């Protein structure tokens, strides 16, 4: 997005990112940069140890034996990818990680969760992973030579609006990685076809004045509430409370049977 929304949302680096294309007759440093970009984006910005590097796959990429898409596929099918994104993760979290790493976006629909779940159950991890890389979406956006990059913050064709909002649930910042087993943030949002408010970068903070307590910190409590007292006006509720009233607010939410969806510093 433009700068004025980008600084607020903390997506300036994503907006100014340039797609990396491995051209013909590329030099050694270009292949090095392409390999580094693939490792950064497919492995979700983890500190990749040299012992976890795919030496044979990057050799084939260097020697023009395979394309960038094939190297992306080799990294995605690698046991390193399995260990940090599949073997200790629930299936819904795993496929949103696949969507972020391979297509650069958040899941659009619960049917996309229904897909890749049956596909896993019928054809294994390899077929399920190949679905993303062989998809029509991967071909027009990245092709055989462009490193995949995150696209959820920009308006795409055949895109649902929720994708942009849901993007901030899967991209938590430039200095973030997908490293810690964790559950998806999009489960209820995808299942019930909703959208969650975006609280990223500086968007989450709210005015404090003299209303915040001793340590001048407000917390936003997003809860799901029903009538258990006073009339409930909305199913969704947001509560801004100081630190000193955080335990009391939590306990009275608990005794009303209200489900807490999120707590963030505001």
């Amino acid at each position: 997005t433009s700068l004025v929304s980008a600084q607020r949302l903390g997506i300036v680096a994503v907006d100014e990112a340039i797609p990396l294309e491995l051209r013909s007759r590329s030099t050694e440093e270009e292949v090095d940069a392409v390999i580094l970009a693939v490792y950064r984006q497919v492995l979700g910005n983890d500190h990749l140890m040299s012992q976890e590097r795919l030496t044979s796959a990057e050799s084939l990429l260097r020697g023009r034996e395979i394309s960038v898409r094939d190297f992306v596929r080799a990294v995605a099918l690698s046991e390193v990818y399995r260990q940090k994104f599949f073997h200790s993760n629930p299936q819904n979290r795993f496929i949103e990680l696949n969507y972020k790493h391979l297509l650069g976006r958040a899941p659009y629909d619960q049917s996309e969760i229904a897909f890749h779940t049956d596909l896993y159950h019928q054809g294994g991890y390899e077929a399920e992973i190949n679905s993303y890389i062989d998809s029509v979406e991967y071909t027009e956006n990245f092709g055989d030579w462009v490193v995949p990059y995150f696209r959820g913050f920009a308006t795409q064709r055949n895109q649902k609006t929720v994708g942009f909002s849901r993007s901030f649930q899967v991209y938590r910042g430039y200095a973030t990685s997908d490293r810690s087993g964790s559950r998806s943030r999009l489960t209820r949002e995808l299942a019930r076809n909703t959208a969650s408010p975006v609280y990223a970068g500086s968007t989450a903070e709210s005015l404090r004045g003299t209303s915040a307590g001793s340590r001048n910190q407000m917390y936003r409590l997003q809860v799901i509430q029903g009538a258990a007292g006073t009339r409930v006006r909305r199913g969704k509720a947001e509560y801004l409370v100081s630190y000193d009233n955080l335990s009391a607010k939590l306990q009275q939410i608990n005794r009303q049977g209200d489900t807490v969806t999120m707590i963030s510093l505001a």
């Binding site: 993760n89 629930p90 819904n92 049956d118 159950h121 559950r183 998806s184 489960t187």
Partner: protein
Amino acid sequence: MFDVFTRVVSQADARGEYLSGSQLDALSATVAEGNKRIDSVNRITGNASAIVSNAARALFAEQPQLIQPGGNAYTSRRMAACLRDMEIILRYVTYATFTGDASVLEDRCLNGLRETYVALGVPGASVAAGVQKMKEAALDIVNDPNGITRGDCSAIVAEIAGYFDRAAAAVA
């Protein structure tokens, strides 16, 4: 995931000391229990389709409302997803039985299953009832005495029963 051995290893590495003698003898006792563990895994695996189908049939018999039109197991795709969920739960129970540790069952299957069900409207209590049906069906299969060397499999049966209960508790 962890197995029965790596679980002790990870705790020891975090504490930064070698496994004590007692931990080594405990793992050795697990080793002496290994053939019966493999037999139980093989027996549940060999009857897995029968286990899932019979448990599902019994579950839909006592809960006609699951398969009633508008019910959560109505329509072919939802019913197929339901049978898939039964099969998935049974498979990770066998994985947990094989490893001697519940991490694969917890991390891959049970983590997030409850709120997935709640979000989607899949009745977790009915899933728990189906898992309980697979429980006794598989425990009779594991404890079947004919065509196997005799011995006490009560400890293995208790462990497999615990995995099934953990699954039943997680989905509800």
